Symmetry: C4
Subunit: 357 residues, 4 copies
Amino acid sequence: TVTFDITNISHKAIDIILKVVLGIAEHEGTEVTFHSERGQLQIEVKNLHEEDKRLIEQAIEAARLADSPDPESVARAVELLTKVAKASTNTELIQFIVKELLELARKLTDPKDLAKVLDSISELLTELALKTGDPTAALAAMVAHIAELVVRLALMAERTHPGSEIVKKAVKLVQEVAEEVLEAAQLMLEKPNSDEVAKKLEEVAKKAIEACIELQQILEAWAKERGDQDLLREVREHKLQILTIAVAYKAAQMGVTVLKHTHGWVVFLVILGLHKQQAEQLLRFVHRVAHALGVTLSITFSGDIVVIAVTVGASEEEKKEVRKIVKEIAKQLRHAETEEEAKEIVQRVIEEWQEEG
Amino acid sequence: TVTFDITNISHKAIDIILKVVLGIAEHEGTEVTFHSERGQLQIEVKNLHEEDKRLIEQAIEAARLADSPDPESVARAVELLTKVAKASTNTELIQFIVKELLELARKLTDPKDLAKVLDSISELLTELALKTGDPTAALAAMVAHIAELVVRLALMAERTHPGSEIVKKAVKLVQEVAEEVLEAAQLMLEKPNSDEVAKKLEEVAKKAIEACIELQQILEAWAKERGDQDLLREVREHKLQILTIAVAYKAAQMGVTVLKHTHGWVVFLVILGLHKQQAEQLLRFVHRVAHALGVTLSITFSGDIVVIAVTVGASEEEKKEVRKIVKEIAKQLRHAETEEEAKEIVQRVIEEWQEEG
Amino acid sequence: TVTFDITNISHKAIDIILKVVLGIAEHEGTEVTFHSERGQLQIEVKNLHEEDKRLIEQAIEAARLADSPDPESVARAVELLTKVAKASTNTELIQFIVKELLELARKLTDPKDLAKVLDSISELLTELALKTGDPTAALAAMVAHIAELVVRLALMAERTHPGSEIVKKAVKLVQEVAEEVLEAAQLMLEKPNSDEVAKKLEEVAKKAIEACIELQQILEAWAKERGDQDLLREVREHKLQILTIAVAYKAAQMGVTVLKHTHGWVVFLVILGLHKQQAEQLLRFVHRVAHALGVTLSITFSGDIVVIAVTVGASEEEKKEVRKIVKEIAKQLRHAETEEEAKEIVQRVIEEWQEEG
Amino acid sequence: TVTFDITNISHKAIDIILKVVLGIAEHEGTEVTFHSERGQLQIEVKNLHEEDKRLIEQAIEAARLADSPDPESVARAVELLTKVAKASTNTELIQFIVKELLELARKLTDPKDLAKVLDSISELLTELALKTGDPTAALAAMVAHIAELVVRLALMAERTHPGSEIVKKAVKLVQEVAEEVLEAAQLMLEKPNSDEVAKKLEEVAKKAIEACIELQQILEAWAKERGDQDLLREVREHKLQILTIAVAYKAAQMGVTVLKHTHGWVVFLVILGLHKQQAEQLLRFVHRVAHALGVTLSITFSGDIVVIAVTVGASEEEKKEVRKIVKEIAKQLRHAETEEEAKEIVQRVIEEWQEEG
């Protein structure tokens, strides 16, 4: 017989523990006893397996921290609730954790800690994708990578800024996007497999990309005021990654396959199996986002194939090589049927050229 | 032949009398006849006997009372209309009686009349259970019993207090409960065998439990001022009863079987046939209500079987024997298949216990 | 051929003329040929009836009157439009006439023309009965007849009263009832056999009966102050008539057969086939109206058959004659199984009463 | 290969170009290449035809002009986008062109540039009729012809007395009518082959007819204040054409055949096969419109044939000939079955009559 002890604990925290304990006991098909003394709580269980024991202890630790006002205790609680969700077989428990997490996010005000919680939200969405098996949650995993890029930009802001009303605007936008994301995470569990989830997720993705563009402008302005060409290089490399995942998101909303590569001052994407309407909507989204980012493009289209090359500033003598590569990719892709060929073709084009990169 | 009169009466009182006369006359089916006058009535039906005549007399007495301001006349009227309902072959006469009660309740409030009103409402809900066969009326009977026990607390308030703003607040709360119950009674007649009755009755049970907790605190606070250990004993026994009925009510909303026992300082419940979601709701309801009441719980779970027991104020030495007994009750219950065996098993634990007590 | 001139009346009036003139083609798929310019019109037809020419003449005269302020010209026009409607094979022309009647009524203010208008509205509702073939229109015909008897009372008021704010209230009430009746006449053509027609007609009847009661009380109060016992006898007989018709209306809305007789200071009704619910509502309606009128009822129920009789001002001796007659009519009608036999039985009792009246 | 250049333009103008280039690549599916930065764009396409190259060039010229505030550049842009739409394989390109037309019209405040836009709207409605085959678009082509007569009226206002507060009122009316036409075009674009488009078009036609009547008042009042018999002739001869189109428009809501002819001071129409239930709507609409225009109509009908003759006025000795002609045409039309007969019948009557024409 295993036994657990819980003290100074709220009704809210007891609700989590009862959901967990009864959920685990129903999974095990086993007997449970609960005792209370003057509002303290004790729990006893038969034939329990060790990770389920550890999960009850971890839920207990999480709930004991969740009653706190302390933001470090919030970050650790969110990490533990994330571990509980990452183990979870139970949908109502995931729903209740998502609802607790929305409140735990709303507790935070400061970017240094909000980074920890956004990383945890990425893990939450990662598990939610594995739980649902749904391309609508693969979009949420791409939005999580956009948020992870927002966290990397936030860490750059911590590395550089003294604090200002621009940082207050930034953390408000980030916190608001975090709330918009967790509202979509709730909606995905309240209406699984529905078009309204994709509509909300597109409004989320739009809002996130616009926030990213503003964060890039903030960091670029700070880099231009200080003359920091090295920070501007790091940010430039992140611009390419942001557009990469943004393109991945739009392609995934259409449900088409994507392959991608990086080499210093140039980044490449190949997209396969497109059609007229999707291709136009994508190319519109690409050109609008790229124009807002201020990044130099080369693109080519052949109905189902789309090739996108995204570039940092370079000489025209360097841009000639990108112009060559784009036409060379469009030559070499022309007879393939499967992504394992396409990967080898792109690698072959690289192996036929890379000395000039 | 039967003949009756009025000195003066309202048109609504005439409508009740006419509905009663038409009903009692038509019941003979194959031959019926009667006549009226501005202030008189006569019936010519062959087959009618004493109780048919007495029902018209009782309706006429109720009608003569119904126009009055007098609350004693109200209490007598609701009793008479309850006697009419208890005989009634038809629910639309009961709809008229409920519409009258929805007016009659509002006129005034005092604990002694309020008690007889809520008790008569319990009787009307009892007849409504027999007319409908719908367990929402049995649920409402448990709620009305809870309310009636609350008016026994109000009679103890008359036993102990000269009256105050807090007592007038309590009177408003119980008057709201009486209104909310009567609204539920009218709704149940409009929408039998539906979920909206269960939702309204849950909002009644919520308000009722909160009013119970409030009144129990009002009396407990006076008992803690005046040192009244005997009033604490009565209030503790009533607390335990209210919780016992409330747990039975919540289990009856799930439609499961309940068995009950009582020994003063310790009180026992067994519940049979619970689903996963039913248990996960029930045990949280039990916890929140018990922790609001301040009572000392024991709970254990075995899938579809749940055992609950409750105590107050037992020594840390006496608590051991209760917790032993609770674990033993579960150990005894494991092999059972029918309700008579469970009754005999719990009785056997009691019949083995009472030699040592 | 036929040829005519409009002498520069409004184009609104031409709308009616064109509707009528083209309407001539409906009779046989009729070979109408036509010419017009600048308010002069000419027609030729194969086998033209004199009635076609009279309908053209009637439409012309009605159109010529329709621009006028004058109430007598409106009363003449309403009669002509009624005379058109009473020939009409076309229902849209009747809808157009109803749309004009709404405005024609609201223009008018004065008793004699208002009487001819409401009388004509009864004729228009009579034609609506002949067009619909439905007893729903007979309900309106009884209500319109009641209103017409109300304007006969208003003519007795004009014959006697000095004019007052009470008369201005009376005119306003009759105007409202007229517009409510005409709204029901429009609704009968827009939504035939809808439940909304039965709802609107019942509201019209309810409102009209309350206006009847009010006007009957207004005239009775003035006739009491003037001292005219003979005018009070007429008014009381007109009360009894309107009550009699109102009972017939309510029973006809229930869909059941009614038979009627009038015999000076006492009036009689028989109704065949009332359900319990119908008998209950009819008894409520009868009682409420009777107390609002101040009349002495007598009623008996014998299965689905109901007998009603009414009086005022009977001596303590003549009250015995009513009780005798009512008991006897019931006693003989208890063996009655057909309409002509029941008519003969009621006649036989009343013919035998010539030695007692 | 086609290769083309784009100096600085709006992202809307880029969106149009991409919609066009991809919307052309629709046909052959051949490869496309793009290069860009935040102020410049360049495009290249392979295995593409001369007419496709012209469409690309025309879209390029349209995009280059579309950002401009200049009214002449707006007129040319709508003309070019129309010239693209007039060949289009792609429905969404028409949708986008019309959507930007809404704003391109709202930008204009010049009567002659708005006239080129209204002319282009007639062409776009012509293409929309050729795309849909919908009689609701043929109705709109008649509304566009009314708008051409509005344009001709506006050009006569410029020819005579521009710039007054009365002309500013006219400009507001024409701009409102243009907006109402364009919003009706958007509704037809969103929901082809549905009754709500015809109900919207009726509001447009109503406003257009009222605007035409007002423009006729404006010109005729000035013409009377100059004594200008030739301007009175030109305007009155356009009144005939306005009524001619208005008749055809209303008849096209039934979808019936219409034939029309002109000879100096008189204009004639014939309408074939009207069912009575429709004829009663049409004849009334015609007579209402004619009375508002103030023109001396002669209207005739016989069975299902309607003959309309419009006159500006002459002596009774001239009016006799129109009366004779209308009667004779009605006699002559009796036996025909097809429009090639009817044209020749009317032409034969006119060619026999023109000795007094």
